[PDB]
Amino acid sequence: SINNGTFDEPIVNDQANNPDEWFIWQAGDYGISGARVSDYGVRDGYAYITIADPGTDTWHIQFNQWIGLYRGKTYTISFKAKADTPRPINVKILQNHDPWTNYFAQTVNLTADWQTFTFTYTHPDDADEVVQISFELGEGTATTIYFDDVTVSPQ
């Protein structure tokens, strides 16, 4: 399941050695675009991520964690989110390697007020057993985005 979904502990950000804890990937680090996060952290029980350059596609900035799920089983995906200026983000369940098949994908419009978003999800019979949750923060307005109470739980 999700580790540090309440944000009582710092964001680890070590994709190479601990991808099962929260990490950020940015396209600017890979010669793909200018996509860059200037600051991130936790305070008062929530996560914040400050975008300096959003890149040119939604996946150019990702806030992700690997998770194990059972084939054929139904889950609930839930999270709280907001942003200093109104804009969209995506939420996905996808493979953690090429070809990055998206098993679940939705877009949500954020405002300056905290709101909650909750979706049912059935893991496909032939999906990989280890996948990742991904919040895609690229393309849209450069601003600060906030998260809290992220869960992926059996129905």
Ligand X SMILES: OC[C@H]1O[C@@H](O[C@@H]2[C@@H](O)[C@H](O[C@@H]3[C@@H](O)[C@H](O[C@@H]4[C@@H](O)[C@H](O[C@@H]5[C@@H](O)[C@H](O[C@@H]6[C@@H](O)[C@H](O)O[C@H](CO)[C@H]6O)O[C@H](CO)[C@H]5O)O[C@H](CO)[C@H]4O)O[C@H](CO)[C@H]3O)O[C@H](CO)[C@H]2O)[C@H](O)[C@@H](O)[C@@H]1O
Judge contact between 53 and 142, C-beta under 8 A.
yes
Find which of Ca ion, ligand X, none residue 64 binds, CB within 5 to 8 Å per kind.
Answer: ligand X
Burial of 96 (0-12, 13-18, 19+ CB in 10 A): middle
By CB under 5 A, name the one of 45, 68, 72, 154 that touches Ca ion.
Answer: 45
Q: Provide the 3-class DSSP secondary structure of residue 139.
A: coil
- For position 103 contacting ligand X by CB under 6 A, the verdict is no
Token pair, residue 110, equals: 């954020």
Helices (H) and strands (E) in the chain, counts: 0, 10
Find which of ligand X, Ca ion, none residue 90 binds, CB within 5 to 8 Å per kind.
Answer: none
By CB under 6 A, name the one of 56, 102, 141, 153 that touches ligand X.
Answer: 102
Which residue's Cβ has the minimum distance to Ca ion? 45
Contact residues toward ligand X (CB under 6 A) are: 25, 30-32, 59, 62, 64, 94, 99-100, 102
